[model samples]
Target: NSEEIINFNCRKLVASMPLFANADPNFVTSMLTKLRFEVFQPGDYIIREGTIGKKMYFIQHGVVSVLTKGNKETKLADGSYFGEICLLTRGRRTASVRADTYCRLYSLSVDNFNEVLEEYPMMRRAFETVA
Candidate 1:
């Protein structure tokens, strides 16, 4: 079932990422219920700078680029994440992101993110410490 599959994937993600390593299983389960999985094609603009962003992505496959000024780029591959600043500050994006290849990702909306974080302040603190 897709729910079971998604649960398994969320469990794996929590296991691998320190941000979620200390999170309660129940919390992760609830958080997983609010996430959405997506696939982006190469050359797709995953995020655009200065635009208001309401979601953040967790990469499950392929690669993406965090772009800034000319000639400066950071590559993010499987298991990495991006687009948090806007979520945290409720402001415009600081960088543009694009799919470097076909990418599979899980995304969380601002409302869900805030709900989870507010419900579990320590988790929010954990992310804040990391950022």
Candidate 2:
């Protein structure tokens, strides 16, 4: 299951992310292994603008619209990820991600996020900078 996720354009996409590009190999391996599946239907809200989001997502094979306050102005597609700002800022979710299609993605929970960051505290700076 993880292999499939890694192969679906994730090979290049993950490597392109500054946060993971040169991260400790063990750190990258841990997070990749912890990722779990999430499938959303059209019109589903993947993340809400004002809610506290506990998980961040990796888009596998579909598109999701990013809506800001009274703004349905932007969108994202395959291989891009979202929902991390809330995880980093510890503030309310910044945007509402609504699915435009049957969105197949993977998610990492706060603790799934917490487990590794606790070890690689150094990566936090880079992650935040990337955010």
Candidate 3:
């Protein structure tokens, strides 16, 4: 049902990006399995700065803003992903993310994140490197 819809959409999104151009298809499939759905209100603090991050989110719909202490703001719409650096460092979120619309998201818990990473330990060249 909706799960398949999510997976299919993300699969095409994965292909559209250069980061996943050479990545194993199995890795993408595994990641899709780990994601759980979430909906955030416009006033929601999707991710808070200085707080430990337990999950990473991939935006499926709507818009979100990234805010820093300098009061700098950055906005991302559907298909954006965040919280990976904090997840990898096992540290606090570096910036705060606020929902700017009726944001729909897919969240991956740190536990499952590790499981996927552990499984694809070799597939890592960093998305930055590939992108």
Candidate 4:
């Protein structure tokens, strides 16, 4: 079942995030082993603007928005991510994210972010791209 394999591999993809660079593959694999999957509906408010960015999200499927003001604001699509700068800078979310259609995301806390980045230095560029 390559799909099953990819499902497991998907979590590692999140672990590969620059934030989790220092994370051990073994630990990431373990955590990936337990990642929860979610299906978000259209117009779902994934994260509201002006809130604290306590967690970062990895989009597995579907599209989302990077609304500037609120749900009635600008939009960003698939493969695009938001809330990173806030998380890194310890600032409030400058934008809100919402499901444009349907979406699947891997959510991780700052705790996991520190755990992974401690070991993988190469992953820094991913974050730098955003910074």
Candidate 5:
């Protein structure tokens, strides 16, 4: 039922994203257990530039713009992700991310992210490959 639906969505994320294409099944399951669902309205500042980002976000639906110096640098849609730079570096956000449309997303905190990666070297390498 409800649990299955959540798992199914997580499975879909793993299947669709090249970042997790070769992830361990147990790792994927463990990561999914810590995923948090979030939504944003149009014009919302999902990630503000110069602010510390404690979580990374995976877009499930809708559009968002990556802004640097108040200009749109790129657009992200389903299966895309952001906020990794801050989480990985423990530094301020390099750019702002604003919702262009209503958005649905999944987020994982930096602590949980590091914890999982620490226990899974392969997964850490996978992330490094993408980063």
Candidate 6:
């Protein structure tokens, strides 16, 4: 069924990422419920530098680049993530993230992020490691 497939894919998306590999299924399920899904067409700007970042995004599919000034850029593939630093620190995006291919992403807002972390300290630490 479509609903079952969606559930399976969401769990698979979380399980496929190392950041959540050690996470409890209950935590993952709760986190998934707070996620917002967005699709980015190729060449879309997911995060533009200088804009305030209030959310973190998980890349479920496609390629993206984190580009800063001075010709510096880092590319990320499927199962990648970014934007945590700004989200946690209440700062502007340090770099722009652009989709290089059509992308499916799951986003977590700052409020939901804090809610999850407040109850799961280790989850906060996991994000800190990446932040």
lDDT of 4 by residue, 31-77 (tens): 56545455578988877767777676667778887766434555555
lDDT of model number 5: 0.69
Residue pairs with backbone overlap in model 2 = none
For all predicted structures, in order, the TM-scores are 0.73, 0.74, 0.72, 0.63, 0.72, 0.70
Error of 5 at 95 (Å): 0.7
Model 1 regions more than 4 Å off: 1-7, 14-19, 69-71, 120-131
Inter-residue clash pairs, candidate 4 = 20-116, 20-117, 21-117, 21-120, 22-116, 22-117, 22-118, 22-119, 22-120, 23-116
| lDDT by residue (tens digit), candidate 6, 1-131 | 00112234676675555545666777667668876777788988888878887876777779988887576688887877776555645767666788989877777676775676546676777766644
Let me know the TM-score candidate 4 reaches against the reference structure: 0.63
Clashes of each: 0, 0, 0, 10, 0, 0
Q: In candidate 3, residue 116 scores what lDDT? A: 60
- Candidate 2 versus truth, CA RMSD in Å, comes to 3.9
* Cα distance off (Å), candidate 6, residue 67: 0.8
Clashes of 6: 0
lDDT of 5 at 21: 53
Candidate 2 lDDT over 15-103, as tens digits, reads 44566667776776677776677778899887787887677777887888876766556778887887656566466776678899887
Cα deviation of 24, candidate 6, in Å: 4.6
Please tell me which model should have the higher lDDT, number 3 or number 4. 3
How well does candidate 1 match the true structure in TM-score terms? 0.73
Please give the distance, in angstroms, between residue 124's alpha carbon in candidate 3 and its true position after superposition.
8.3
Model 1 agreement with the true structure over 1-131: per-residue lDDT tens digits: 01123435565663454545566776666668766777789998877888887777778889998886464788999888876564654667677898989987777665775677557676777655533
